[PDB]
Every structure is written in C-alpha cells, then in structure tokens.
Design a protein around this ligand. Structure first.
Ligand SMILES: CN[C@@H]1[C@@H](O)[C@@H](O[C@@H]2[C@@H](O)[C@H](O[C@H]3O[C@H]([C@@H](C)O)[C@@H](O)[C@H](O)[C@H]3N)[C@@H](N)C[C@H]2N)OC[C@]1(C)O
Ligand SMILES: [Zn+2]
Lengths: 118, 129, 48, 98, 87, 216, 208, 25
RNA sequence: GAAGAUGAUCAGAUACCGUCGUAGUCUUAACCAUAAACUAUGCCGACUAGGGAUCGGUUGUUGUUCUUUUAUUGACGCAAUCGGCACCUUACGAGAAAUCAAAGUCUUUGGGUUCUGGGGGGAGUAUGGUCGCAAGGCUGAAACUUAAAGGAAUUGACGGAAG
C-alpha cells in the first residue's frame, strides 16, 4: 500500500495555504519550489511532499477541498457571501400584494388588529 | 381506603411544594385540615387558601410561597403529656429555634409553643418547618 | 405502609411479633433455650 | 441480573401461552418466545425460470410462489444465524433491520 | 442570622429563585441571573439600568424557565398578553 | 508567576473581586486554584487516606495511588479533593488542587441561645454517597465533635465546634463517608430558615461591573 | 412599560407571514401550548405572531443589556442558519459559532477556541443541544428559536417560530439584529428603513 | 449436585428410613 | 413416549443420535395440593413528568369507501373522555448497582393492613403431631461445623461463541 502519512499530508496542506499562487500542477516545478521553501531533512520526504502537493493542487482546480484554505478562495467566497438580491424574496410583489394564507391564519391576522389584504 | 384525609392533604402539599408549584388542590376537606392549614398560614408557611363547596366533603385550593420545607402528620395520634412534648420536638424538628409540632388539645388545635404558653397538652397531630 | 401495624391499639401485635422474631437471634435463642446449661461441655461455667 | 425487561418473550397480561415445535429440532417453545419468520419464495430458482418458460405449453404463465411461516427455538435460531448476539444497548432495538 | 448583640454573624446571605423562592446554592452552575434592558420612550436602552431575575437550576432543568420568565416579565410590564393565568 | 485563562482569574489577579463570598453569591465556576489561594491565604489540608487501586492487564496488575485530601480555613470554608496518580506525591498534590477548587461556604449556627459567635449548625443536614449516609445534628456548646476521626477532621477544618453525628451504611469506605459528610455540611446554605425569608435585591455580578477588567 | 411604537407593525406581519413563520409542527409540547393560536385541520399548528414579536423584542432587550457585545454567542449547526448567525455576528458585533460545535468550548478552558459568553442564542434546541448542555454547566442563559416541538430544557427565553424553514430562520435573526441595533442607537430610530435586506441572512444552495 | 438431584437422594434416603422403622412401628 | 429392548458412537457409556415400545398421553367418577405456580416485585388509598400507539364503553365531528340516490347502514377519518394490556423518553427522585413511573413522595425517617428474613452449612434433616390409598403435603428442631458464602458492576484472560 501507498497511503501517505500525516507528515507529508500536513506539510502539503501548509504549503498550499501559504504559497498557492506560485505553485503549479507539475511535479518538477513543485519539487524545486518545495526545495526552496521547505527545509526538508531528506530527499525522499521532499519528493513525497511535492507529489502530494501536486495531487492536491490538481484536485483543487476541479473544485474546493476540505481543510485547505488560501487567501484567494476565502476572498471570493466572501464576495459571494455579501450578495444582496436587488429584488427581495420577502417583498410582497411576488404575489401582487396578496397573501395565500389559509382562513385560520387569516383570522390570526384579523385578531391582532391588522386588516392587511389576503 | 381513605384512612386519613389530613395525611392526603399534607402529602399533596409536600408534593406540590417540592416540584416548585405555587398552588395545590386538596380533596376531601375537613375541619381538622382547615385548622392545620390555619396554623400553617399564621406562621407564614402558606398563602391564602379557599374552600370550595360541592355539597359533599368539599375541596380546597392552597397558595404556596416557597417557604415550606416539610409538613406531615404523625400517625397514630399519640397521646402526649406535657413533659413529653420535648422529646417530640427533639425528634421531629430541624432545630430548636423554628418549626412546630402541631397538637390537638381540649383547648383546640395549636402549635406546641402556644400549648406551652397555655400549659395544655393533648394528642400529637403533625408538624411543619 | 412499612408492613407493620401502626394503630394506637396495636400494641399486642407489635409485642408478640417482636417476641416471635427474636428467636432468629442466635444469642437470645441460646439464652432462652438453655443450651449452655444443658449441652455445653462445661455446663455453662468459665473453667472446668 | 435481569437481562431483558420482557424476559426474552412477549407475554404481558396473560398467564399461559401454548407451545409450538421448533422447525429444526422439534423443541417445545412458547409461541410468543419463538423466533418466527414469514417467507415468500419463488417456487423455481431464478436460474431455471427461463428453461421452464421455454418448456411451458402456456404463454404468459404466472409462476407460483412458496409461502411458509418458520418457527425456531432460541438455540437453533442462534446456531443458524437467524438472529445474532447483539450488544447491550443494541439489544433494545426492536425495529427490523435493513 | 445574628447574635444577642444584634451583630449579623452570617457570611453570604444567598440569593433566592425568582420563580420558586428556593435558595440558589453556591455550586448551582445550572442557575442563571438574567438582566433585561430598560427602554425609554425614545426607544433606546438606558445604559446600566436593568431589571434582573434569577432562576434555580431546578426550574431551568424542568423546562419551566421560559414560562416563569413570561410570568415575571409580564408582571413587571416588560411584556403584555403572552402569559395567561387561567389554563 | 501565574497568568489567568478565565475571566474570574483575571478579576482576582486584579484587586476587583476580593472575597470568595462574591463568587459564591453569583454561583460562579472556579476553574483555577490560584483564585482560592489568593482569596483564602490561610488554608490547612489533611491527607485522610491513601489507597492502592489495581487494573488487570495481560502482563500483570497496573497499580495506581489514590489520595483523599480535606482542606479548610477552620472559619467556615471547607473543601474535599480526591485524585489518582501513579505516585503518591503527585496524587496528593493534585488532590490538594482539586480540593481547593471545591471550597464551599459552611453556615454555622447556634444550639439554643445566640450568645457569642456561632458554634454549631443551624439545622439538621444529611448527606449521602454510595451506601453511606452521614447525619449532622446541632449540639450544645460544651460538646466536642462527636464523630469518627475522619468526619471530625472535616468538621474541624470547616470551623464547626459542637456537633453530633450519626452514620449508616458501610462507613469503612472512607471516600464515600467523606463525600457524604461534605454534602451534608454543604446543605447548611440550602436549608431555608425563617430568618432568610426576607427578599434581598439581586446585586449585579462582579463580571458585569468589571466587564472591561475581565476581558483579557 | 414599552411605548406603543414597539407594537407589532403591519409590514412586520407581512414579512413574518410570507415566510411561513407561523407554521408549527404537527404535535406540540405542553410547554409550547400557549404559543399555539390554533390547529389547521391538516395537522399543522398556527403560532401567535404577536407573541413571537413580544419574545423577539424581549430577547433583543436581553441581548442589548450585555455590556460587551462580544460576550453574546450566537449558534447554529443546521445548514439553514449558519449564514444568518454569521451576518448577525457581523452587524451586532457578537461572536458566532456556525456548523459543528466543539464539545468543550464552554467547559474546557485550555481549548484554543475557549469562550465564556455572558449569553447564548441558539437556532434549534435539538440540533444545538451541546451548546445548551455546556451552558447549563457554566451558568449561561439561553435564548432559543423554538418550534412547537423544540425541547424546553435549559432554555431561558424561547422565541416561538418555525426554526425548520429556510426563510423563517433568517427572518427571525434579521429581526433580532434590527431590534438590537435600534436599542443600542446604531439605527437612529424605529421607522427608518435599514441598510440591510432580509435576503441577507437567507441561506443558499451552492449552485444558485 | 444440581440441588434438584440432592432432594431426590434425600427422597430415596427418607423412603428407606420409612421401611427400616416400619419393621418395629 | 418415562421403564425396558435394540443399532451406533466411545477408552467405557446401561447417555446424547437411530429403531421399537410399556406406563403415561385422552375421557368419566374420585384423589393428590405441588412448579423458576415469576413481574423472582402482597393488598387497599392519595399524590408526583413528558410522549405516541392500542383494546372496551360513551360523547362531539369528514377532501373517505360503501347501502342506495340519500336517513336511524356500515366501515374508515378527526377529536374528547372513563376503564384496561403495554410501550418510548427523562431522571426531579430512588438505588450497591443492574436498573425503577415505581423499586419515587424513605435520618426532612409515621395513610391502613397481612405475611416473610436476620452470616454460611447441618436442614426443610431428625423427632412428635397432622392430612393422604400411596407417592408425598403441612408443621418443624438441636448437637455439631465454618470465615466467609453471597449480590451488582470493572479491567483482563479464556470460550468446541459471533463479526
Ligand atoms: C420450635 N421453634 C419455634 C418456632 O416453631 C416458632 O414457633 C411458632 C410460634 O412463634 C407461634 O406462636 C407464637 O405466636 C402466637 C400468635 C399467633 O399469637 C402466640 O399466640 C404465641 O404465644 C407465640 N408463641 C406458634 N403459633 C407456632 C410456632 N411454630 O418460633 C418460636 C420457636 C421457639 O423458635
Ligand atoms: Zn430448535
């Protein structure tokens, strides 16, 4: 089996959080990048970390990944976060000024001193 | 069968009190129950209470104010001489400074301090503290 | 409740019930059967 | 200790339940305690369905099913894995499995 | 509690439940003390002026805390026609 | 050389919260023992029992040491602590820490007349743990502490002078006896008496009037 | 008491009613019978909207009385309510807890995200039972959005609503945040329109 | 001995004492 | 199908397994009176918390199927209620725990009342009495002996247990 242990996986996640923009989908470029960025004590571990980083970067491009977060994805999901629809879903224009509430709710409405149209 | 209406009344009071209720229903009523409740109310352990006529034994609603720790009957109604009130007070009450043993004397139903003032004794009926 | 009579006029029942059940107490039963007097090697003395 | 609140059977509010004989060993087990399984099976194995369809003198003949209710004692039920020993908290689950 | 000279020989006169009048024990960590903001006619909560209630861990654990607060708040005018006395 | 991790610890390192009665009055959790050392400088602890507990393993028994510690200022505050550790010394230190974290107020009272300071309990309190139930009765002023030595030591550390005691169940189980006695003596401020019938205003929490000083 | 301005206003009744907030569960707890206006003969339970408003204003007042807004923890584990609590913490200055609640947040005082709220607000007592339980361990009042079937254990102030609807949860949190801002003085007064739409605080599926 | 089979042994033992002593009433 | 006979198995099996088979199994008249005859939980009475089902009775009420097109058809559906067999959650409370809606309202110890126990054995034995056709039932000791026996749970180990 070839399950990658916690050390390589955590190191890959840290690398992607910190240095996502300067990191690509190729193993050789990521190998040199890991060599310059990370102080890895062995070349075998360096290659394993570079390869797993390549795997994660290759997965990300198709869609987000749990655990990982870099300061471009968070900005874009914040921009999507602050979205205010110009027309409101609770604006009563969607039924043309009327409620569809059943008669029991209509008597609730009356009994609170309101005469809003149904 | 029902053997002591006072026992049922005081048990219902305790079970309402421990659950945090502020009111409790009592059935049946009796003169002894009303006198015991009046002794309790005089010392502040219960609020007001209201008797409900039903052309029968009656019902009572009692108001509870959270000061009651326990009330209960002593069954049998043991005969108590004057010099034996002290052992009942030692046995039944939490401390010497508060709480009451409730007696039925030929002078009427009273707490043991009123009994000591009038120098009377009868049968033991209950307690409250 | 509690399975013993509580009545004010129940003294005979309580006294006889206690009398019956002390026989299960080995010390009391030995004393009232007179076992030390009739079956002990020393006949109930301290020395022999 | 008491292992089950239901005593390992299903008798509340009656005195006696007549027995049934275990299918496997013919032991007498009370009907409420017996492990019971309702089975409806195709009379022909699914392999021979096409052979018997080809050989039929009829066209569109609905093949009959086998109906049987099976009764087991506890020993044979456990031995043949109709039921299994469960954990202390899992024993309380009474809904059928999936 | 106090002595013959009247001296209050008593540390820590403890709090009592607003709903049941029970004493709030020192290690009753399920008990809470609500503070509620006074509102003026202008509609702005007055600073540092609060109406406060205390509930025992018992009343809260029994699920009666919401009803007890309804009762207390409506009896102080913090609330109208939500709590009915007659059920 | 201590830095608090909770708001109460921060308020106690500052001179804002000065008495543990403030903590008790608002039923505040106490998760740092430096608070108790700071607001109760005079505390005496007694190690009451040391037990050896064993867990069976494939290779043999695993033995751990269990220590019960009682702590008190002999002036109305008392605490109980039990903890297990591989060595006796570490178990004792940890039990002292947990005993300090559990200090409670004890209500002293009078038997009869209120002459002098309170000398006994104000009512009858019972506590129960396991099979052991410990009952504490107010005693007249000349009586010692009429109790077994473990319960007696707990009574002395709480500051009680005159008390009667009754025990039932398996009292030789020292831990359960001490927990029952600790529970009973701690019920002296749960028993409502007529002199406590008077309503008191709900004082603001020391975490409200010191919201800034409790931040960080 | 409370001036007549604080009454339930018709545009609020519009907003509340269009969201099916008044839709309660089939069955109702005994403690929540006061909140049931009446039962539609389908089986649903109508909720008194006026009492909902009263409890919203009450909860807003309790949230306002906390001297430090950061000590007011708002919680949601349901998918439909994390956006709402995130926006509530954004506008009011509260500390939010969205998604999984880590057991030990209130009781384990060495966990990194250890917090000691003065007050806790919860979207659902069923789905956020852990927050309520730990708050019971450490003397913290709870304000909960409660449906007709929501448990009442260790809840101080219940806000009757439909805490199972997508629109209702966001609506309730929006109303709470608006009332809090009004009471503090951020919003100048009680008639002016707020800068924020109720659409903000509404959850969304991820593919829009 | 599975308490049941001890009782059956005393049953048989007691049954034989009933016959030894019947020789003499 | 006890007994018995007999074939296997087995070191031996007068056992389990196979084949027979007497009493018995059934019934009518009489006896016998015992079971893990168990919920191992006396009976009467009051009170204390949430929930959905279900059987019997009664009382108000349909987008339902059906007499017949409809009533006083019937079934089903929706609500209340008294009684019952139970169940689920909780644990305020109880408990050594397992667990318990009673096994709660019990050192804050008293509603009425019956029965039973007092370390383990000897022993439900001996003896006397009594009931029975008998088998046995009921009542029921002592000498002597002994430091534990026992309950519930924990960790391990083991299992011709399971995964
Ligand atoms: C031979 N041992 C006996 C033992 O059999 C038993 O004796 C009872 C005895 O207590 C009963 O009798 C007892 O109780 C009755 C009660 C009903 O009123 C009293 O009248 C009677 O005086 C009293 N001894 C008696 N009816 C039967 C004996 N086997 O208990 C006492 C004992 C001495 O240990
Ligand atoms: Zn079988």
């Amino acid at each position: 089996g070839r399950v990658r242990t916690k050390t390589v996986k955590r190191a890959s996640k840290v690398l992607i959080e910190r240095f996502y923009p300067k990191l690509t989908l190729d193993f050789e470029t990521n190998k040199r990048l890991t060599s310059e960025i990370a102080v890895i004590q062995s070349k075998r571990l360096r290659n394993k970390i570079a390869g797993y980083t390549t795997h994660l970067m290759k997965r990300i491009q198709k869609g987000p990944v749990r655990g990982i977060s870099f300061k471009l994805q968070e900005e874009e999901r914040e921009r999507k976060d602050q979205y205010v629809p110009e027309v409101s879903a609770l604006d009563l224009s969607h039924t043309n000024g009327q409620l569809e509430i059943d008669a029991d709710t209509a008597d609730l409405v009356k009994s609170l001193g309101f005469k809003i149209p149904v | 069968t029902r053997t002591s209406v006072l026992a049922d009344a005081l048990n219902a009071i305790n079970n309402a009190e421990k659950t945090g209720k502020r009111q409790v229903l009592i059935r049946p009523s009796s003169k002894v129950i009303i006198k015991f409740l009046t002794v309790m109310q005089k010392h502040g352990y219960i609020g007001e209470f209201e008797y409900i006529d039903d052309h029968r034994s009656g019902k009572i609603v009692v108001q509870l104010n959270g000061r009651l720790n326990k009330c209960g009957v002593i069954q049998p109604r043991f005969n108590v001489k004057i010099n034996d009130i002290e052992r009942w007070t030692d046995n039944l009450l939490p401390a010497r400074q508060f709480g009451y043993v409730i007696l039925t004397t030929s002078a009427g139903i009273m707490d043991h301090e009123e009994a000591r003032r009038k120098h009377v004794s009868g049968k033991i009926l209950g307690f409250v503290y | 409740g509690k399975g013993k009579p509580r009545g004010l006029n129940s003294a005979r029942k309580l006294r006889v019930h206690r009398r019956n059940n002390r026989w299960a107490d080995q010390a009391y039963k030995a004393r009232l059967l007179g076992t030390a007097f009739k079956s002990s090697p020393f006949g109930g003395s301290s020395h022999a | 200790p008491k292992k089950r609140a239901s005593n390992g059977r299903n008798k509340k509010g009656r005195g006696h339940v007549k027995p049934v004989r275990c299918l496997n060993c013919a032991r007498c087990v009370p009907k409420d305690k017996a492990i019971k399984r309702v089975t409806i099976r195709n009379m022909v194995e699914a392999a021979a369905v096409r052979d018997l369809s080809e050989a039929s003198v009829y066209a569109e003949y609905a093949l009959p099913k086998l109906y049987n209710k099976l009764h087991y004692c506890v020993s044979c039920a456990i031995h043949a894995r109709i039921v299994r020993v469960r954990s202390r908290t899992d024993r309380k689950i009474r809904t059928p499995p999936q | 509690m106090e002595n013959d000279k009247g001296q209050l020989v008593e540390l820590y006169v403890p709090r009592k439940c607003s709903a049941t009048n029970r004493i709030i024990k020192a290690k009753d960590h399920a008990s809470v003390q609500i503070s509620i903001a006074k509102v003026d006619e202008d509609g702005r909560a007055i600073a540092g002026e609060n109406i406060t209630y205390a509930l025992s861990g018992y009343v809260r654990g029994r699920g009666e805390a919401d009803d007890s607060l309804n009762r207390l708040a409506q009896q102080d005018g913090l609330l109208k026609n939500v709590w009915s006395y007659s059920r | 050389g201590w830095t608090p991790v909770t708001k109460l610890g921060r308020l106690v390192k500052a001179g804002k919260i000065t008495s543990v009665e403030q903590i008790y009055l608002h039923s505040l959790p106490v998760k740092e023992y430096q608070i108790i050392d700071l607001l109760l400088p005079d505390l005496k602890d007694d190690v009451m029992k040391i037990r050896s507990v064993q867990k069976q393993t494939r290779a043999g028994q695993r033995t751990r040491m269990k220590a019960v510690v009682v702590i008190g200022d002999s002036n109305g505050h008392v605490g109980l602590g039990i903890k297990t550790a591989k060595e006796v010394a570490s178990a004792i230190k940890a039990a002292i820490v947990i005993a300090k974290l559990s200090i409670i107020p004890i209500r002293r009272g009078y038997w009869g007349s209120n002459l002098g300071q309170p000398h006994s309990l104000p009512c009858k309190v019972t506590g129960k743990c396991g099979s052991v139930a410990v009952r504490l009765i107010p005693a007249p002023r000349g009586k010692g502490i009429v109790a077994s030595p473990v319960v007696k030591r707990l009574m002395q550390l709480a500051g009680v002078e005159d008390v009667y005691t009754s025990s039932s169940g398996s009292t030789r189980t020292t831990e359960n006896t001490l927990k029952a006695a600790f529970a009973a003596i701690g019920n002296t401020y749960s028993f409502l008496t007529p002199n406590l019938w008077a309503e008191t205003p709900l004082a603001a929490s020391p975490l409200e009037v010191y919201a800034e000083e409790a931040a960080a | 008491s409370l001036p007549a301005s604080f009454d339930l206003t018709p545009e609020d009744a519009k907003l509340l009613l269009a969201a099916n907030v008044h839709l309660g569960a089939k069955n109702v707890q005994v403690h929540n019978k006061p909140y049931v206006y009446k039962t539609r003969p389908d089986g649903m339970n109508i909720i008194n909207i006026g009492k909902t408003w009263e409890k919203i204003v009450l909860a807003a007042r309790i949230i306002a009385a906390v001297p430090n807004a950061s000590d007011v923890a708002v919680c949601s584990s349901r998918t439909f309510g994390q956006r709402a609590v995130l926006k509530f913490a954004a506008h009011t200055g509260a500390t939010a807890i969205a998604g999984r609640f880590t057991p030990g947040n209130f009781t384990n005082y060495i966990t990194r995200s250890f917090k000691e709220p003065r007050l806790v607000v919860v979207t659902d007592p069923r789905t956020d039972a852990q927050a309520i339980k730990e708050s019971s361990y450490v003397n913290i009042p709870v304000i909960a959005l409660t449906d007709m079937d929501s448990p009442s254990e260790y809840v101080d102030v219940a806000i009757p609503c439909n805490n199972k609807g997508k629109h209702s949860i966001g609506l309730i949190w929006w109303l709470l945040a608006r009332e809090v801002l009004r009471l503090r003085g951020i919003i100048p007064d009680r008639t002016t329109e707020w800068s924020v739409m109720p659409d903000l605080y509404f959850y969304r599926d991820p593919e829009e | 001995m599975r308490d049941k089979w001890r009782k059956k042994r005393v049953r048989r033992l007691k049954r034989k004492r009933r016959k030894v002593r019947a020789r003499s009433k």
